[PDB]
Design a protein around this ligand. Structure first.
Ligand code: ADP
Ligand code: MG
Ligand code: MG
Lengths: 20, 341
């Protein structure tokens, strides 16, 4: 399932902002 | 934000904003007037700590920024924008900036403390919000952007991590780090990977339309439990975003899917919020049929979820973070760069 794939991914925690 | 036609309202709101924007408040407090308690959260740029105002006994959320780090990360002008804009705005769903000041090493922004915690943690724990629940928060963001864009402001970092739930279960938008007052197009690469509009990734000039695209991602993530474009690395996320292809969960209603196709629209001549009909294309959409916009603004609607607060100073709604000593140099640093802060 998509949820299963997301939960197993490396970006389920707080995401930092990006810049140049 | 302080609690409580449209064209008239925004006219007076703009008058109020321009006054503060032209003459920003400055140096309205100092470090030793607060007792530092605990870190509530961190981002790529700052550390926000729960603090206790000695004189008033009030609790606040103090954002601390290391000047040298700001310079290294090319955020000098962004930080000046952040403070200048936050001290000038006023809306029911925007976090209020109480004080601001600096010292030899850091920059400080003391905001009202929103103890409900990040929308992020509640969303991940619960899994996903039911459509009516997501709609509630969505409406508040829609109204907040209507207000911000009317002031020629672009927000640029909409995400659950930058959204807080207050004691009444209402949303408070924080982190104006990428906020900017711009009439025309702008080009800086900034935001958060998952929420970036196609035009940002492709290094094109863009405008407030990126905020409406970000809203599409937020609504999708709230209702689905995961974002519309995810992967292990930003580059992989960017490829999915530009391809534009989006798949919705089977439990998404017809109205929600239609709104999302119109928000997560790669074509700027078709993206809702950016058309001739402005924000009304969104507010008059079917998915928001049951939404009473005035009631939302007036905060007369019952929140779907009301956070638990075991008293003042309670941080149980926030994760724990490693603490670091707030050292202040004997030598002033980057004084010229941040003279107007
Ligand atoms: N007014 C506030 N009340 C409570 N927590 C806050 C407040 N402002 C920010 N935070 C917390 O601090 C974190 C970092 O703040 P932010 O301004 O987002 O830093 P950065 O700009 O580096 O992202 C937020 O994600 C949130 O958890
Ligand atoms: Mg942030
Ligand atoms: Mg920020």
């Amino acid at each position: 399932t998509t949820y299963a794939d997301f939960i197993a991914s490396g970006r389920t925690g707080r995401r930092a902002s990006i810049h140049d | 934000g302080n609690a409580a036609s449209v064209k008239e309202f925004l006219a007076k709101a703009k008058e109020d904003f321009l006054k503060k924007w032209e003459t920003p408040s400055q140096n309205t407090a100092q470090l030793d007037q607060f007792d530092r308690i605990k870190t509530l959260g961190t981002g790529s740029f700052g550390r926000v700590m729960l603090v206790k105002h000695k004189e008033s006994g009030n609790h606040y959320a103090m954002k601390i920024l290391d000047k040298q780090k700001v310079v290294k990360l090319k955020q000098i002008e962004h930080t000046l924008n952040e403070k200048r804009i936050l001290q000038a705005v006023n809306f029911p769903f925007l976090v209020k900036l109480e004080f601001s000041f600096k010292d030899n090493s850091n920059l400080y922004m003391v905001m009202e403390y929103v103890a409900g915690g990040e929308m992020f943690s509640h969303l991940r724990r619960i899994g996903r919000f039911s459509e009516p629940h997501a709609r509630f928060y969505a409406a508040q963001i829609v109204l907040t952007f209507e207000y911000l864009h009317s002031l020629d402001l672009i927000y640029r970092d909409l995400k659950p991590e930058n959204l807080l739930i207050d004691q009444q279960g209402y949303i408070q938008v924080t982190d104006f780090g990428f906020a900017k007052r711009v009439k025309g197009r702008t080009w800086t690469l900034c935001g958060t990977p998952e929420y970036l509009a196609p035009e940002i990734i492709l290094s094109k000039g863009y405008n407030k339309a990126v905020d409406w695209w970000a809203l599409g991602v937020l609504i999708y993530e709230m209702a689905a439990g995961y974002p519309p474009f995810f992967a292990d690395q930003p580059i992989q996320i960017y490829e999915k975003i530009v391809s534009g292809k989006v798949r919705f969960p089977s439990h998404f209603s017809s109205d929600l899917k239609d709104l999302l196709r119109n928000l997560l629209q790669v074509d700027l001549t078709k993206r809702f919020g950016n058309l001739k009909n402005g924000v009304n294309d969104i507010k008059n959409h079917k998915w928001f049929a049951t939404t009473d916009w005035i009631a939302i603004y007036q905060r007369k609607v019952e929140a779907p979820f009301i956070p638990k607060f075991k008293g003042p100073g309670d941080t149980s709604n926030f994760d724990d973070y490693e603490e670091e000593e707030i050292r202040v140099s004997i030598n002033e640093k980057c004084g010229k760069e941040f003279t107007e802060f």
